[PDB]
Amino acid sequence: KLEDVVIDRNLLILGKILGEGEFGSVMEGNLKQEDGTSLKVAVKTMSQREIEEFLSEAACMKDFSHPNVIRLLGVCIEMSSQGIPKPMVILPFMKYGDLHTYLLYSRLETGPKHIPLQTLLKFMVDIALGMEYLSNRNFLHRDLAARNCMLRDDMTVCVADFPVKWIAIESLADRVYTSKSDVWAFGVTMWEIATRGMTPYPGVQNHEMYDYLLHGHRLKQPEDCLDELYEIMYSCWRTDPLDRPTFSVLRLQLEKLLESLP
Amino acid sequence: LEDVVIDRNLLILGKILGEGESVMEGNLKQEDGTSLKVAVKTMDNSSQREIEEFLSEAACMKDFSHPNVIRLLGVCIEMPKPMVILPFMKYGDLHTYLLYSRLETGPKHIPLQTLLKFMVDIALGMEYLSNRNFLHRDLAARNCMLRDDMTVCVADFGPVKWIAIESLADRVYTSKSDVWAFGVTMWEIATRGMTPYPGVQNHEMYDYLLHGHRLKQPEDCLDELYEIMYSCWRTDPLDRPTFSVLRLQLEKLLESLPD
Ligand SMILES: Cn1cc(-c2oc3ncnc(Oc4ccc(NC(=O)c5cccn(-c6ccc(F)cc6)c5=O)cc4)c3c2-c2cccc(N)c2)cn1
Ligand SMILES: Cn1cc(-c2oc3ncnc(Oc4ccc(NC(=O)c5cccn(-c6ccc(F)cc6)c5=O)cc4)c3c2-c2cccc(N)c2)cn1
């Protein structure tokens, strides 16, 4: 259940805040490894059922191994002074942070260097490689977005999960979720990357989203987005879920597109 | 006061264009018999009603005249909710226009020379307003409006990242605080609609400024253009330029560029 994923609270040292809000709090931390060495980590803390659902999320994350899906380093159990459990999820710390902030930063002079096309396409390939993995596992992500993608120390992206505009039209009206709903969100993520941090659908408010989409309107081709990267991303927004490509078809579409450019 | 009000008969309300906690399209019948497309913003607190002091705003502003300041065609009184009548502008607000420029099926890619014109435009309007000793107190690319001829005029639909550091700690507003909002708006334009201070939340903003940190130079911003907007963010208000000085620096920079 939680055996081999639980870490004794003694082995964790919490530091400053990385980000706060209404998905808990994520902070830097030191994790004492059975190696005897210490490791830099991100510890996301946060209610009766929200506790067990929190531990339920580490369930069907405990055993996920792919270079493009975020690793779990463990779960912790902190006892309140009142004795209530306070669950904590432990992740490897990533100095480069989430992809959304990194895309915006690239447009500033003192942030990361200007990201070329080949690198933006590798960003999507990484997400495609990982979501393809998670699709084979028959795991529904349901929150795919640039803000949820983390950058590894080797500048490879990995999928994670800390929002109407990333939700497929079929899931908006009827509260359902298929693998194809995930694929719709992937199309929006490639839009964020190709726009380098733009909020989806400029000009349209959240409450109009279902109707905007019900009238056949889709995200606009980003300026300087090449005319075949847009088809791959537009293919994720077909109205029938069954008519959308699979994560494995998309990945190849991006891989062979990447190695056509110099 | 009166003599700036218009009869509700000569106004016809249409669909909503935006809403807070509202702007509607409409038609206005004018003295010359013609009908003009207008925006109608419908505002207040009535337990006690400083509309007496708001008609002042509508009065003091409806007799200003400058190409880079929005025209106010008058006020309409309905019994009671006041409504403000502005000319309709198909190109809409500048913020939404900048983002559109980065997408095909939208206004074409704005070159830097045109982007400087948007800046010159705004500085001109604020030079006019500050010479009349008028305090905007909310200047941003969202509050700017694009005329039928491509031209920006200052308005206020009626914002921590745009507020100056002196106005955060204390609550003082001066023409120097508006100059701070100008440099942020300049940064908005150079980034074609980026939210200020990526990576910083709103609660950190005051602490972020008190440590000497400012907005970062855009990916392609000329050094001279970053120097002008950086002047707007000096920690001492008395060391920031005035809108008249600012106007001439942007006009000289813009004319130094190729056509
Ligand atoms: C400079 N800087 C750096 C950083 C920073 O570094 C980091 N390193 C690591 N994690 C970081 O946050 C996190 C924290 C938790 C997660 N996830 C889960 O907990 C999780 C749980 C249960 C299940 N799943 C899951 C679901 C579906 C899947 F398919 C796979 C997994 C999950 O993912 C992902 C990221 C950061 C950050 C940070 C912190 C706060 C805000 C921001 N914006 C960045 C900050 N500033
Ligand atoms: C495609 N599209 C286009 C449009 C659209 O067209 C338009 N035409 C005209 N007004 C438009 O809204 C307005 C409405 C009111 C104002 N202001 C005042 O009322 C005002 C009052 C009292 C005082 N002051 C003032 C203060 C300081 C000054 F220095 C000067 C004046 C003022 O300003 C400015 C804009 C639009 C829009 C619209 C509508 C909704 C949302 C968005 N985002 C755009 C929509 N969609």
mmCIF file of N, CA and C in Angstrom, chain B residues 100-213:
data_model
loop_
_atom_site.group_PDB
_atom_site.id
_atom_site.type_symbol
_atom_site.label_atom_id
_atom_site.label_comp_id
_atom_site.label_asym_id
_atom_site.label_seq_id
_atom_site.Cartn_x
_atom_site.Cartn_y
_atom_site.Cartn_z
ATOM 1 N N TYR B 100 -2.922 39.519 -30.118
ATOM 2 C CA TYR B 100 -3.402 39.171 -31.453
ATOM 3 C C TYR B 100 -2.299 39.272 -32.499
ATOM 4 N N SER B 101 -1.365 40.211 -32.326
ATOM 5 C CA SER B 101 -0.290 40.392 -33.293
ATOM 6 C C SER B 101 0.637 39.186 -33.363
ATOM 7 N N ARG B 102 0.659 38.354 -32.327
ATOM 8 C CA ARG B 102 1.512 37.176 -32.286
ATOM 9 C C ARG B 102 0.822 35.935 -32.838
ATOM 10 N N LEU B 103 -0.372 36.082 -33.408
ATOM 11 C CA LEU B 103 -1.104 34.967 -33.993
ATOM 12 C C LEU B 103 -1.585 35.343 -35.386
ATOM 13 N N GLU B 104 -1.409 34.427 -36.336
ATOM 14 C CA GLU B 104 -2.030 34.564 -37.644
ATOM 15 C C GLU B 104 -3.546 34.439 -37.512
ATOM 16 N N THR B 105 -4.257 35.038 -38.477
ATOM 17 C CA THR B 105 -5.685 35.362 -38.401
ATOM 18 C C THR B 105 -5.908 36.570 -37.493
ATOM 19 N N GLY B 106 -4.836 37.309 -37.232
ATOM 20 C CA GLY B 106 -4.861 38.476 -36.389
ATOM 21 C C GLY B 106 -4.048 39.587 -37.019
ATOM 22 N N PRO B 107 -4.157 40.796 -36.469
ATOM 23 C CA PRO B 107 -3.353 41.919 -36.971
ATOM 24 C C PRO B 107 -1.892 41.530 -37.147
ATOM 25 N N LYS B 108 -1.325 41.930 -38.285
ATOM 26 C CA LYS B 108 -0.007 41.462 -38.695
ATOM 27 C C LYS B 108 1.053 41.815 -37.655
ATOM 28 N N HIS B 109 2.195 41.135 -37.763
ATOM 29 C CA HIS B 109 3.294 41.322 -36.822
ATOM 30 C C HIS B 109 3.695 42.788 -36.751
ATOM 31 N N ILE B 110 3.533 43.382 -35.574
ATOM 32 C CA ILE B 110 3.867 44.787 -35.364
ATOM 33 C C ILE B 110 5.383 44.934 -35.337
ATOM 34 N N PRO B 111 5.974 45.702 -36.247
ATOM 35 C CA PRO B 111 7.414 45.963 -36.163
ATOM 36 C C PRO B 111 7.725 46.885 -34.995
ATOM 37 N N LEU B 112 9.016 46.964 -34.666
ATOM 38 C CA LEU B 112 9.436 47.796 -33.542
ATOM 39 C C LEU B 112 9.081 49.260 -33.771
ATOM 40 N N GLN B 113 9.234 49.742 -35.007
ATOM 41 C CA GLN B 113 8.940 51.143 -35.298
ATOM 42 C C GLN B 113 7.491 51.484 -34.972
ATOM 43 N N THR B 114 6.556 50.622 -35.378
ATOM 44 C CA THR B 114 5.162 50.811 -34.991
ATOM 45 C C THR B 114 4.986 50.707 -33.480
ATOM 46 N N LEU B 115 5.732 49.803 -32.837
ATOM 47 C CA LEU B 115 5.616 49.641 -31.390
ATOM 48 C C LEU B 115 6.034 50.909 -30.657
ATOM 49 N N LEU B 116 7.059 51.598 -31.163
ATOM 50 C CA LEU B 116 7.456 52.874 -30.577
ATOM 51 C C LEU B 116 6.367 53.924 -30.745
ATOM 52 N N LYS B 117 5.645 53.886 -31.869
ATOM 53 C CA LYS B 117 4.549 54.827 -32.079
ATOM 54 C C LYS B 117 3.474 54.666 -31.011
ATOM 55 N N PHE B 118 3.125 53.419 -30.677
ATOM 56 C CA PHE B 118 2.214 53.173 -29.562
ATOM 57 C C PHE B 118 2.725 53.821 -28.280
ATOM 58 N N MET B 119 4.047 53.846 -28.094
ATOM 59 C CA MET B 119 4.625 54.449 -26.897
ATOM 60 C C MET B 119 4.569 55.970 -26.972
ATOM 61 N N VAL B 120 5.086 56.542 -28.064
ATOM 62 C CA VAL B 120 4.987 57.984 -28.295
ATOM 63 C C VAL B 120 3.553 58.460 -28.092
ATOM 64 N N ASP B 121 2.596 57.762 -28.711
ATOM 65 C CA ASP B 121 1.182 58.096 -28.561
ATOM 66 C C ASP B 121 0.789 58.267 -27.098
ATOM 67 N N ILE B 122 1.130 57.288 -26.258
ATOM 68 C CA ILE B 122 0.692 57.320 -24.866
ATOM 69 C C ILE B 122 1.389 58.443 -24.105
ATOM 70 N N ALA B 123 2.697 58.609 -24.317
ATOM 71 C CA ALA B 123 3.421 59.685 -23.649
ATOM 72 C C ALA B 123 2.836 61.049 -24.000
ATOM 73 N N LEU B 124 2.439 61.236 -25.261
ATOM 74 C CA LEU B 124 1.806 62.488 -25.667
ATOM 75 C C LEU B 124 0.537 62.749 -24.865
ATOM 76 N N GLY B 125 -0.356 61.758 -24.804
ATOM 77 C CA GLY B 125 -1.583 61.924 -24.043
ATOM 78 C C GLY B 125 -1.338 62.220 -22.576
ATOM 79 N N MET B 126 -0.363 61.537 -21.972
ATOM 80 C CA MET B 126 -0.059 61.781 -20.566
ATOM 81 C C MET B 126 0.696 63.087 -20.364
ATOM 82 N N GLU B 127 1.478 63.515 -21.358
ATOM 83 C CA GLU B 127 2.036 64.862 -21.324
ATOM 84 C C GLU B 127 0.925 65.901 -21.260
ATOM 85 N N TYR B 128 -0.130 65.705 -22.053
ATOM 86 C CA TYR B 128 -1.282 66.598 -22.007
ATOM 87 C C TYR B 128 -1.956 66.551 -20.642
ATOM 88 N N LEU B 129 -2.188 65.344 -20.122
ATOM 89 C CA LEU B 129 -2.955 65.208 -18.888
ATOM 90 C C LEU B 129 -2.163 65.704 -17.685
ATOM 91 N N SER B 130 -0.850 65.467 -17.669
ATOM 92 C CA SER B 130 -0.043 65.924 -16.545
ATOM 93 C C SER B 130 0.190 67.428 -16.596
ATOM 94 N N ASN B 131 0.211 68.017 -17.795
ATOM 95 C CA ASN B 131 0.311 69.469 -17.886
ATOM 96 C C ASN B 131 -0.946 70.136 -17.346
ATOM 97 N N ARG B 132 -2.104 69.513 -17.555
ATOM 98 C CA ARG B 132 -3.335 69.905 -16.885
ATOM 99 C C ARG B 132 -3.395 69.422 -15.442
ATOM 100 N N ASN B 133 -2.301 68.849 -14.932
ATOM 101 C CA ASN B 133 -2.216 68.384 -13.547
ATOM 102 C C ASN B 133 -3.284 67.335 -13.243
ATOM 103 N N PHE B 134 -3.412 66.355 -14.135
ATOM 104 C CA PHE B 134 -4.386 65.285 -13.972
ATOM 105 C C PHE B 134 -3.664 63.987 -13.639
ATOM 106 N N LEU B 135 -4.162 63.285 -12.619
ATOM 107 C CA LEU B 135 -3.596 62.019 -12.164
ATOM 108 C C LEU B 135 -4.471 60.875 -12.662
ATOM 109 N N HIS B 136 -3.940 60.084 -13.598
ATOM 110 C CA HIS B 136 -4.654 58.907 -14.081
ATOM 111 C C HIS B 136 -4.908 57.911 -12.952
ATOM 112 N N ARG B 137 -3.831 57.410 -12.349
ATOM 113 C CA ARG B 137 -3.746 56.475 -11.224
ATOM 114 C C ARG B 137 -4.029 55.028 -11.624
ATOM 115 N N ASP B 138 -4.344 54.739 -12.887
ATOM 116 C CA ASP B 138 -4.249 53.370 -13.397
ATOM 117 C C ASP B 138 -3.863 53.460 -14.872
ATOM 118 N N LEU B 139 -2.574 53.326 -15.161
ATOM 119 C CA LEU B 139 -2.077 53.324 -16.531
ATOM 120 C C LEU B 139 -1.569 51.931 -16.876
ATOM 121 N N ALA B 140 -2.149 51.329 -17.910
ATOM 122 C CA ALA B 140 -1.691 50.036 -18.395
ATOM 123 C C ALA B 140 -2.119 49.888 -19.845
ATOM 124 N N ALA B 141 -1.484 48.937 -20.536
ATOM 125 C CA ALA B 141 -1.838 48.661 -21.924
ATOM 126 C C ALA B 141 -3.298 48.256 -22.077
ATOM 127 N N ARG B 142 -3.923 47.749 -21.012
ATOM 128 C CA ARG B 142 -5.331 47.380 -21.087
ATOM 129 C C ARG B 142 -6.234 48.606 -21.072
ATOM 130 N N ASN B 143 -5.797 49.692 -20.435
ATOM 131 C CA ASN B 143 -6.572 50.923 -20.365
ATOM 132 C C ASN B 143 -6.338 51.845 -21.555
ATOM 133 N N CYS B 144 -5.532 51.427 -22.526
ATOM 134 C CA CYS B 144 -5.275 52.200 -23.731
ATOM 135 C C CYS B 144 -6.177 51.718 -24.860
ATOM 136 N N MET B 145 -6.539 52.637 -25.755
ATOM 137 C CA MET B 145 -7.503 52.339 -26.808
ATOM 138 C C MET B 145 -6.960 52.744 -28.172
ATOM 139 N N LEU B 146 -7.244 51.902 -29.164
ATOM 140 C CA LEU B 146 -6.738 52.029 -30.526
ATOM 141 C C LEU B 146 -7.790 52.669 -31.429
ATOM 142 N N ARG B 147 -7.432 53.778 -32.078
ATOM 143 C CA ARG B 147 -8.394 54.506 -32.890
ATOM 144 C C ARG B 147 -8.477 53.899 -34.291
ATOM 145 N N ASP B 148 -9.414 54.417 -35.096
ATOM 146 C CA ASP B 148 -9.633 53.859 -36.429
ATOM 147 C C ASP B 148 -8.385 53.980 -37.296
ATOM 148 N N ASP B 149 -7.777 55.162 -37.311
ATOM 149 C CA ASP B 149 -6.382 55.298 -37.698
ATOM 150 C C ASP B 149 -5.518 54.707 -36.596
ATOM 151 N N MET B 150 -4.508 53.918 -36.972
ATOM 152 C CA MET B 150 -3.780 53.234 -35.914
ATOM 153 C C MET B 150 -3.128 54.287 -35.031
ATOM 154 N N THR B 151 -3.617 54.375 -33.798
ATOM 155 C CA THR B 151 -3.301 55.451 -32.870
ATOM 156 C C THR B 151 -3.794 55.028 -31.497
ATOM 157 N N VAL B 152 -3.027 55.338 -30.458
ATOM 158 C CA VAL B 152 -3.387 54.978 -29.095
ATOM 159 C C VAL B 152 -3.831 56.230 -28.353
ATOM 160 N N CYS B 153 -4.914 56.102 -27.588
ATOM 161 C CA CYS B 153 -5.390 57.167 -26.723
ATOM 162 C C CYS B 153 -5.603 56.616 -25.321
ATOM 163 N N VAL B 154 -5.406 57.480 -24.333
ATOM 164 C CA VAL B 154 -5.442 57.081 -22.932
ATOM 165 C C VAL B 154 -6.883 57.051 -22.441
ATOM 166 N N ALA B 155 -7.219 56.031 -21.650
ATOM 167 C CA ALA B 155 -8.534 55.938 -21.033
ATOM 168 C C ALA B 155 -8.413 55.177 -19.718
ATOM 169 N N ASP B 156 -9.562 54.926 -19.091
ATOM 170 C CA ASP B 156 -9.622 54.145 -17.856
ATOM 171 C C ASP B 156 -10.957 53.416 -17.828
ATOM 172 N N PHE B 157 -10.931 52.106 -18.090
ATOM 173 C CA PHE B 157 -12.146 51.303 -17.981
ATOM 174 C C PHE B 157 -12.790 51.428 -16.605
ATOM 175 N N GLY B 158 -11.994 51.678 -15.570
ATOM 176 C CA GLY B 158 -12.516 51.842 -14.225
ATOM 177 C C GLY B 158 -13.079 50.569 -13.622
ATOM 178 N N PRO B 159 -4.158 45.489 -9.475
ATOM 179 C CA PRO B 159 -3.137 46.056 -10.355
ATOM 180 C C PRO B 159 -1.850 46.384 -9.607
ATOM 181 N N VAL B 160 -1.402 45.451 -8.763
ATOM 182 C CA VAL B 160 -0.229 45.692 -7.926
ATOM 183 C C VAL B 160 1.011 45.905 -8.784
ATOM 184 N N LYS B 161 1.178 45.088 -9.826
ATOM 185 C CA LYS B 161 2.381 45.142 -10.649
ATOM 186 C C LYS B 161 2.576 46.492 -11.331
ATOM 187 N N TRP B 162 1.505 47.252 -11.556
ATOM 188 C CA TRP B 162 1.624 48.568 -12.171
ATOM 189 C C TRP B 162 1.744 49.700 -11.158
ATOM 190 N N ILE B 163 1.507 49.435 -9.877
ATOM 191 C CA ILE B 163 1.557 50.471 -8.850
ATOM 192 C C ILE B 163 3.004 50.720 -8.445
ATOM 193 N N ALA B 164 3.340 51.988 -8.217
ATOM 194 C CA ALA B 164 4.701 52.364 -7.867
ATOM 195 C C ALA B 164 5.015 51.986 -6.420
ATOM 196 N N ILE B 165 6.314 51.917 -6.120
ATOM 197 C CA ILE B 165 6.759 51.451 -4.809
ATOM 198 C C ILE B 165 6.353 52.436 -3.715
ATOM 199 N N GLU B 166 6.475 53.739 -3.981
ATOM 200 C CA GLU B 166 6.042 54.735 -3.005
ATOM 201 C C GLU B 166 4.544 54.643 -2.749
ATOM 202 N N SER B 167 3.762 54.312 -3.777
ATOM 203 C CA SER B 167 2.320 54.182 -3.628
ATOM 204 C C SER B 167 1.911 52.860 -2.991
ATOM 205 N N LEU B 168 2.771 51.840 -3.034
ATOM 206 C CA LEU B 168 2.478 50.602 -2.318
ATOM 207 C C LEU B 168 2.648 50.771 -0.809
ATOM 208 N N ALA B 169 3.855 51.143 -0.367
ATOM 209 C CA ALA B 169 4.144 51.255 1.063
ATOM 210 C C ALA B 169 3.194 52.228 1.753
ATOM 211 N N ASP B 170 3.225 53.483 1.328
ATOM 212 C CA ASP B 170 2.258 54.498 1.710
ATOM 213 C C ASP B 170 1.086 54.404 0.739
ATOM 214 N N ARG B 171 0.174 55.369 0.784
ATOM 215 C CA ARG B 171 -0.763 55.554 -0.321
ATOM 216 C C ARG B 171 -0.667 57.029 -0.686
ATOM 217 N N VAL B 172 0.272 57.322 -1.582
ATOM 218 C CA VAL B 172 0.435 58.627 -2.204
ATOM 219 C C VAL B 172 0.409 58.426 -3.711
ATOM 220 N N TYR B 173 -0.297 59.303 -4.413
ATOM 221 C CA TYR B 173 -0.321 59.269 -5.867
ATOM 222 C C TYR B 173 0.090 60.627 -6.405
ATOM 223 N N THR B 174 1.081 60.627 -7.296
ATOM 224 C CA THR B 174 1.572 61.838 -7.934
ATOM 225 C C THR B 174 1.817 61.516 -9.399
ATOM 226 N N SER B 175 2.130 62.547 -10.189
ATOM 227 C CA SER B 175 2.425 62.299 -11.595
ATOM 228 C C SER B 175 3.632 61.391 -11.783
ATOM 229 N N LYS B 176 4.484 61.268 -10.763
ATOM 230 C CA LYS B 176 5.607 60.339 -10.833
ATOM 231 C C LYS B 176 5.160 58.890 -10.702
ATOM 232 N N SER B 177 4.106 58.639 -9.922
ATOM 233 C CA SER B 177 3.532 57.300 -9.852
ATOM 234 C C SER B 177 2.985 56.880 -11.208
ATOM 235 N N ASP B 178 2.334 57.810 -11.910
ATOM 236 C CA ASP B 178 1.860 57.534 -13.260
ATOM 237 C C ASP B 178 3.020 57.292 -14.215
ATOM 238 N N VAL B 179 4.156 57.960 -13.993
ATOM 239 C CA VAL B 179 5.336 57.707 -14.816
ATOM 240 C C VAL B 179 5.833 56.282 -14.603
ATOM 241 N N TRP B 180 5.750 55.785 -13.365
ATOM 242 C CA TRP B 180 6.081 54.387 -13.105
ATOM 243 C C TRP B 180 5.161 53.453 -13.882
ATOM 244 N N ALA B 181 3.856 53.738 -13.873
ATOM 245 C CA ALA B 181 2.910 52.929 -14.635
ATOM 246 C C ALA B 181 3.188 53.002 -16.130
ATOM 247 N N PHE B 182 3.784 54.103 -16.592
ATOM 248 C CA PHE B 182 4.093 54.245 -18.010
ATOM 249 C C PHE B 182 5.193 53.279 -18.432
ATOM 250 N N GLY B 183 6.273 53.206 -17.650
ATOM 251 C CA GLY B 183 7.351 52.287 -17.977
ATOM 252 C C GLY B 183 6.903 50.838 -17.993
ATOM 253 N N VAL B 184 6.004 50.469 -17.078
ATOM 254 C CA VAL B 184 5.441 49.122 -17.096
ATOM 255 C C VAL B 184 4.618 48.910 -18.360
ATOM 256 N N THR B 185 3.785 49.893 -18.715
ATOM 257 C CA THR B 185 3.036 49.817 -19.966
ATOM 258 C C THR B 185 3.977 49.754 -21.164
ATOM 259 N N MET B 186 5.076 50.511 -21.119
ATOM 260 C CA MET B 186 6.095 50.397 -22.157
ATOM 261 C C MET B 186 6.643 48.980 -22.226
ATOM 262 N N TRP B 187 6.865 48.358 -21.067
ATOM 263 C CA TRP B 187 7.342 46.981 -21.044
ATOM 264 C C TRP B 187 6.287 46.023 -21.584
ATOM 265 N N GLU B 188 5.014 46.261 -21.252
ATOM 266 C CA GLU B 188 3.924 45.498 -21.856
ATOM 267 C C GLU B 188 3.991 45.534 -23.379
ATOM 268 N N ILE B 189 4.180 46.728 -23.946
ATOM 269 C CA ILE B 189 4.173 46.874 -25.399
ATOM 270 C C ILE B 189 5.373 46.172 -26.024
ATOM 271 N N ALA B 190 6.548 46.293 -25.399
ATOM 272 C CA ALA B 190 7.748 45.685 -25.963
ATOM 273 C C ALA B 190 7.681 44.164 -25.939
ATOM 274 N N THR B 191 6.933 43.593 -24.998
ATOM 275 C CA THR B 191 6.762 42.151 -24.897
ATOM 276 C C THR B 191 5.505 41.654 -25.599
ATOM 277 N N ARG B 192 4.787 42.541 -26.289
ATOM 278 C CA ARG B 192 3.505 42.234 -26.926
ATOM 279 C C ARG B 192 2.567 41.482 -25.982
ATOM 280 N N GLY B 193 2.365 42.049 -24.800
ATOM 281 C CA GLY B 193 1.300 41.621 -23.917
ATOM 282 C C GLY B 193 1.677 40.679 -22.795
ATOM 283 N N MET B 194 2.959 40.559 -22.459
ATOM 284 C CA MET B 194 3.349 39.714 -21.338
ATOM 285 C C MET B 194 2.882 40.326 -20.024
ATOM 286 N N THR B 195 2.501 39.469 -19.085
ATOM 287 C CA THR B 195 2.200 39.943 -17.741
ATOM 288 C C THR B 195 3.492 40.404 -17.076
ATOM 289 N N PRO B 196 3.500 41.559 -16.411
ATOM 290 C CA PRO B 196 4.732 42.027 -15.767
ATOM 291 C C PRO B 196 5.249 41.040 -14.729
ATOM 292 N N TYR B 197 6.574 41.017 -14.583
ATOM 293 C CA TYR B 197 7.284 40.268 -13.550
ATOM 294 C C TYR B 197 6.959 38.778 -13.580
ATOM 295 N N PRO B 198 7.173 38.085 -14.702
ATOM 296 C CA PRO B 198 6.998 36.627 -14.711
ATOM 297 C C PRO B 198 7.806 35.964 -13.605
ATOM 298 N N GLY B 199 7.172 35.026 -12.903
ATOM 299 C CA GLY B 199 7.806 34.322 -11.810
ATOM 300 C C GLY B 199 7.541 34.901 -10.437
ATOM 301 N N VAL B 200 7.031 36.126 -10.353
ATOM 302 C CA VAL B 200 6.772 36.793 -9.082
ATOM 303 C C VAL B 200 5.266 36.866 -8.872
ATOM 304 N N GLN B 201 4.811 36.422 -7.702
ATOM 305 C CA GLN B 201 3.418 36.559 -7.305
ATOM 306 C C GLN B 201 3.148 37.980 -6.812
ATOM 307 N N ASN B 202 1.864 38.291 -6.631
ATOM 308 C CA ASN B 202 1.472 39.659 -6.306
ATOM 309 C C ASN B 202 1.838 40.037 -4.876
ATOM 310 N N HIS B 203 1.804 39.083 -3.940
ATOM 311 C CA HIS B 203 2.139 39.415 -2.558
ATOM 312 C C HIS B 203 3.620 39.745 -2.397
ATOM 313 N N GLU B 204 4.495 39.077 -3.151
ATOM 314 C CA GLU B 204 5.922 39.379 -3.102
ATOM 315 C C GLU B 204 6.268 40.738 -3.695
ATOM 316 N N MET B 205 5.334 41.373 -4.409
ATOM 317 C CA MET B 205 5.686 42.473 -5.302
ATOM 318 C C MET B 205 6.368 43.618 -4.561
ATOM 319 N N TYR B 206 5.810 44.040 -3.423
ATOM 320 C CA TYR B 206 6.430 45.129 -2.672
ATOM 321 C C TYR B 206 7.837 44.759 -2.215
ATOM 322 N N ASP B 207 7.990 43.579 -1.607
ATOM 323 C CA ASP B 207 9.313 43.133 -1.182
ATOM 324 C C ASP B 207 10.257 42.996 -2.370
ATOM 325 N N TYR B 208 9.733 42.537 -3.509
ATOM 326 C CA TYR B 208 10.548 42.403 -4.711
ATOM 327 C C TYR B 208 11.105 43.749 -5.158
ATOM 328 N N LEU B 209 10.301 44.809 -5.053
ATOM 329 C CA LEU B 209 10.758 46.133 -5.462
ATOM 330 C C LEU B 209 11.726 46.739 -4.452
ATOM 331 N N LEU B 210 11.447 46.577 -3.155
ATOM 332 C CA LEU B 210 12.302 47.164 -2.127
ATOM 333 C C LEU B 210 13.715 46.597 -2.144
ATOM 334 N N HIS B 211 13.928 45.452 -2.789
ATOM 335 C CA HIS B 211 15.254 44.866 -2.913
ATOM 336 C C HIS B 211 15.983 45.316 -4.173
ATOM 337 N N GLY B 212 15.441 46.292 -4.895
ATOM 338 C CA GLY B 212 16.108 46.837 -6.058
ATOM 339 C C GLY B 212 15.812 46.141 -7.366
ATOM 340 N N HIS B 213 14.850 45.225 -7.398
ATOM 341 C CA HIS B 213 14.575 44.450 -8.599
ATOM 342 C C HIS B 213 13.524 45.146 -9.455
#
